């Protein structure tokens, strides 16, 4: 029964509307849902706007009138110019009238703010259409009506605020360049009057609600008005004194002064410099006497969260940091301004103690600006020595976890904050190394005396200590490091229980890992560190083993050289000792941790540049996996059912993962190890492939979800990853081509092509991409074989929707992209029907929202056009243009204009400009039209314009022929200028959203 309002042949029953509306907003469950769908259908009826005049007159429900205005807003912004001029005048009149009467009824003006604001915005939509050309008296009459009533004056401030926002803040996306400039100039022309009203209202006090609304509009004006309105009037005095005293106006006023601190200002006027000092002086004075003194505990105030304290302290931080980053030099020379300068920074110190992540980042960004300047600018740092000393403590005490202390999901927001904290603290250490050391030593003493002992607190200090590595001299660092480690070791002894002893042990290893300079110069110490880590790899307490492994490879990455040479009082390079005891050292580690250990050993081994010794170290390192490997290749090949034994499958996967880990470290140097296993590894790839196929055959597609098949596919994926990892880093490409590639392709390509879709590994595509990348130029027949084996069968997997097989989707277009780059000849060899699928595949990529596909699709298209162009005037290029030029032009235009691919706008525009420029540089030798459909001799330029005119006429039938003609004329003129080209496209995207766009808009550039 609620569906009655959807029958427009009858009169609209306002009481029925109000019931649907109340059921939606105040109802629940099924009734609410049904009313929602009804209201949506009502609002979307293209004639609903005719019944808004009724609703606004006779409804007593504010939600119903709001919806009526939403309906009018759609009409005004999209179909205004299609109306008979009688309706435009009428709609304007009963919007103006409705606003007047709501402002004259104090009760309505007080209780229906939502509805008045909506009516104001609706009015602004009319102004964007009608003003000032068809409404020159709007502003003079607005100023006149303001004096007759406080309520009307206050509401006019809201209208002007919304007008300024719509013209200056949100026009870039929503109107054409020409219309935006027209409205900006119109507002600029009449602002003198507007400001006069605004200043009179502010100066003569009155309703606080009127004052606040006027200040809210002023905030918008400050985004664009010339500086003279601010510095040649008394307004700064009003803002920085009067309006800071009252809490009602204090929040908006502080935001206004923040924006004032960003005005375009001449930097040579001494008077203006004094005015900029003065309003800062007044503001800080009002804060100290009306809000809180410099000594106040802002941390506690913020935590209590009374009233709007949190927003105010946020706004104060923004004001102080904004002003001081721009103007603090104004305060640094005059001794009468020193107290102000330091009081301002002392407020920031207090603000920096608040427990609020995002606010801390705002203040920290400022501190970075400051300490960087004190680090470089002569004679400044002495001014801020007491501020900086306090800041050292704030930052040390608020240090967050770096990426390396994994003893507690990775937290990327925490990691960025750590790096910002480190940068500031490093500057602060250079500014006064002695003060920094003393604070850190003192903090450490209070960890030992239990005054501030805690897990969080010892971690925080150890992170801070590790973060300043590289700032002290080597002697000071040496004494500093020794003291810290000494004190930390005594702290580990002091505590009982493994949980306490674990935290401290991890902090110790973190600090040492951060001071490689110290480790490099103290071998005996470095040796003892490693040996202690090894013994931690046997500790079964949660997190110890992980820490120990991470610290091991971190130290190795930085000190590898001291592991590869023989040290004074040693008989062998320490890497040999590590390798000898590797089975013992890693016996208690999980597989992932074992692989990290081997990877660390590979880093060391790669620093041995004697080939024979490096290869021997590599052989010794791989002894355990190689022996396990030789065994399996003997057994697994004898009885292929073992590969169903899940323990043999796991052993195999971990052997290969060990090889990947070492190959990751050694790259080109890994080749000898790869050769030891390569041929048997590819045979294993084949045998595993047969088992997966045989399992899918016997059990169905569900087999791919079972642990056994997933374990077998892990083997295949790690083999592909191993080959990919080596080839991506190989230096001898003759061996890659002549030894590795042909066995690889024979092992993987046919298996991929002849598996059912659910059994094909997307990693095959990823491995082939690396092969083509590195040696594609050397294997033209191999690349052809890749396309023949993966192109059509993969395309058929991904060309039915945009969601199935997401990994194959992404890897598919990465492969086509590199083939198009490195081996374009392979596409030339395709049969015509297959090359046609190639074009279809590229356009299919355009239409993805998935950035990981859309971007490559657009890049393949661009590269392909360039590949064709490079061929010159040959039959293949001429056939390409005849067959595909307009397919690419229209497919590109489609994604540009369909509002569902805005992420790819820049590359769509680039591709479109390239295509259009081909014709206007006469880079296409043959006619693009049929011999019949156009007179002989017509230029491709003319035909392109006609094709596009017809295409856009049918796709956007509501555009006038003149709009289309002006758009294309400007677009083709501008096809050598991307920024302007894109502006014209964005103008077109605005105009297709409405009726009656001005065709002269396209002459803006």
């Amino acid at each position: 029964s609620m569906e009655g309002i959807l029958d427009f042949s009858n009169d609209l029953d306002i009481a029925l509307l109000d019931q649907v509306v109340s059921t939606f907003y105040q109802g629940s469950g099924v009734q609410q849902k049904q009313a929602q769908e009804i209201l949506t259908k009502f609002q979307d009826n293209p004639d609903a706007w005719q019944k808004a005049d009724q609703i606004l007159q006779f409804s007593t429900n504010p939600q119903s009138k709001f919806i009526a205005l939403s309906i009018l807003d759609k009409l005004i912004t999209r179909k205004w110019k299609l109306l008979p001029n009688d309706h435009r005048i009428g709609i304007r009149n009963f919007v103006v009238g409705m606003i007047i009467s709501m402002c004259q009824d104090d009760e309505v003006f007080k209780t229906q703010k939502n509805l008045i604001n909506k009516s104001d915005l609706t009015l602004v939509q009319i102004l964007k259409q009608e003003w000032p050309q068809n409404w020159p008296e709007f502003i003079p009459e607005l100023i006149g009506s303001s004096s007759s009533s406080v309520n009307v004056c206050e509401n006019n401030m809201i209208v002007l605020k919304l007008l300024s926002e719509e013209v200056f803040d949100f026009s870039a996306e929503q109107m054409t360049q020409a219309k935006a400039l027209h409205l900006k100039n119109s507002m600029s022309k009449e602002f003198e009057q507007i400001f006069k009203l605004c200043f009179q209202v502010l100066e003569q006090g009155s309703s606080s609600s009127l004052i606040v609304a006027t200040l809210e509009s002023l905030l918008r004006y400050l985004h664009w008005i010339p500086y003279r309105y601010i510095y040649e009037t008394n307004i700064l005095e009003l803002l920085s004194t009067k309006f800071m005293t009252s809490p009602d106006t204090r929040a908006i006023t502080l935001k206004c002064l923040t924006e004032v601190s960003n005005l375009k200002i001449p930097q040579d006027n001494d008077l203006i410099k004094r005015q900029t000092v003065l309003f800062f002086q007044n503001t800080l004075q009002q804060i100290a006497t009306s809000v809180m003194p410099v000594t106040a505990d802002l941390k506690a105030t913020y935590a209590n969260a009374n009233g709007n304290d949190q927003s105010f302290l946020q706004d104060l931080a923004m004001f102080l940091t904004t002003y001081l980053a721009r103007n603090r030099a104004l305060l640094e020379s005059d001794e009468s301004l020193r107290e102000l300068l330091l009081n301002a920074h002392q407020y920031l110190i207090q603000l920096s103690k608040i427990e609020e992540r995002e606010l801390f980042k705002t203040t920290l960004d400022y501190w970075h600006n400051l300490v960087a300047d004190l680090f470089y600018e002569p004679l400044k740092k002495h001014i801020y020595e007491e501020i900086c000393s306090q800041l050292r403590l704030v930052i040390i005490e608020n240090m967050v976890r770096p990426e390396e202390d994994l003893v507690v999901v990775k937290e990327s927001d925490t990691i960025q904050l750590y790096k910002s904290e480190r940068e500031v603290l490093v500057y602060l250490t250079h500014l006064n190394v002695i003060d920094t050391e003393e604070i850190m030593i003192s903090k450490l003493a209070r960890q030992i005396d239990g005054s501030e002992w805690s897990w969080h607190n010892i971690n925080t200090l150890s992170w801070a200590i590790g973060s300043i590595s590289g700032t002290m001299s080597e002697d000071t660092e040496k004494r500093f490091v020794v003291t810290v480690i000494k004190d930390l070791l005594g702290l580990c002894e002091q505590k009982r229980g493994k949980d306490n002893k674990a935290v401290v042990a991890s902090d110790i290893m973190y600090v040492v890992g951060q001071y490689p300079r110290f480790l490099k110069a103290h071998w005996n110490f470095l040796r003892t560190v490693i040996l202690a880590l090894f013994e931690f790899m046997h500790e079964t307490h949660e997190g110890v083993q992980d820490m120990a492994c991470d610290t091991f490879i971190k130290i190795v990455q930085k000190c590898k050289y001291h592991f590869v040479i023989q040290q004074p009082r040693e008989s062998e390079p320490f890497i040999q000792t590590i390798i000898r005891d590797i089975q013992k050292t890693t016996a208690d580690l999980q597989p992932q941790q074992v692989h990290t250990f081997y990877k660390a050993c590979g880093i060391i081994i790669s620093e041995e540049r004697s080939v024979a010794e490096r290869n021997r170290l590599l052989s010794d390192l791989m002894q355990l996996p190689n022996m396990a490997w030789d065994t399996i290749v003997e057994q697994s090949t004898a009885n292929p059912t073992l590969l169903l034994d899940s323990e043999t499958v796991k052993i195999i996967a971990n052997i290969i993962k060990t090889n990947v880990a070492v190959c990751t470290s050694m790259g080109a140097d890994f080749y000898p190890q790869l050769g030891h296993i390569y041929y048997n590894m590819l045979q294993l790839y084949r045998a595993v492939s047969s088992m997966i196929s045989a399992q899918v055959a016997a059990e169905g597609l569900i087999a791919t979800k079972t642990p056994k098949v997933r374990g077998l596919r892990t083997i295949k994926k790690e083999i592909l990853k191993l080959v990919e990892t080596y080839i991506s880093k190989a230096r001898n490409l003759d061996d890659v081509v002549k030894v590795l590639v042909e066995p690889l392709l024979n092992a993987v390509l046919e298996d991929y092509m002849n598996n059912v879709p659910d059994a094909r590994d997307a990693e095959v595509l990823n491995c082939m991409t690396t092969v083509v990348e590195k040696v594609g130029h050397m294997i033209p027949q191999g690349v052809i074989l890749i396309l023949q084996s993966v192109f059509e069968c993969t395309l058929d997997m991904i060309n039915k929707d945009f969601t199935e097989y997401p990994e194959h989707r992404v890897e598919f277009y990465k492969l086509l992209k590199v083939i198009n780059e490195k081996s374009f000849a392979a596409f030339l060899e395709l049969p015509p029907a297959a090359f046609k699928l190639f074009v279809d595949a590229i356009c299919w990529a355009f239409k993805h929202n998935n950035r990981d596909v859309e971007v490559n699709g657009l890049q393949i298209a661009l590269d392909l056009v360039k590949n064709i162009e490079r061929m010159g005037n040959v039959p293949f290029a001429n056939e390409f243009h005849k067959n595909y030029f307009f397919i690419f032009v229209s497919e590109t235009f489609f994604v540009l204009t369909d509002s569902d691919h805005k992420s790819g706008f820049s590359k769509q525009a680039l591709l479109l400009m390239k295509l259009i420029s081909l014709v206007y540089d006469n880079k296409i030798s043959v006619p693009l039209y049929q011999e019949a459909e156009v007179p002989q001799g017509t230029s491709n330029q003319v035909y392109l314009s006609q094709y596009l005119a017809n295409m856009l006429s049918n796709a956007f039938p509501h555009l006038t022929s003149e709009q289309i003609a002006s758009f294309l004329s400007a677009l083709t003129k501008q096809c050598k200028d991307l920024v302007v080209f894109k502006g014209t496209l964005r103008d077109f995207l605005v105009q297709i959203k409405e009726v009656g766009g001005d065709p002269t808009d396209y002459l803006f550039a």
């Binding site: 000494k486 070791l489 042990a505 003892t528 040996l531 202690a532 931690f536």
Partner: peptide, 11 residues
Amino acid sequence: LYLEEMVNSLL
């Protein structure tokens, strides 16, 4: 734990 040799190696 052989954090003990660590103390000595440091002094």
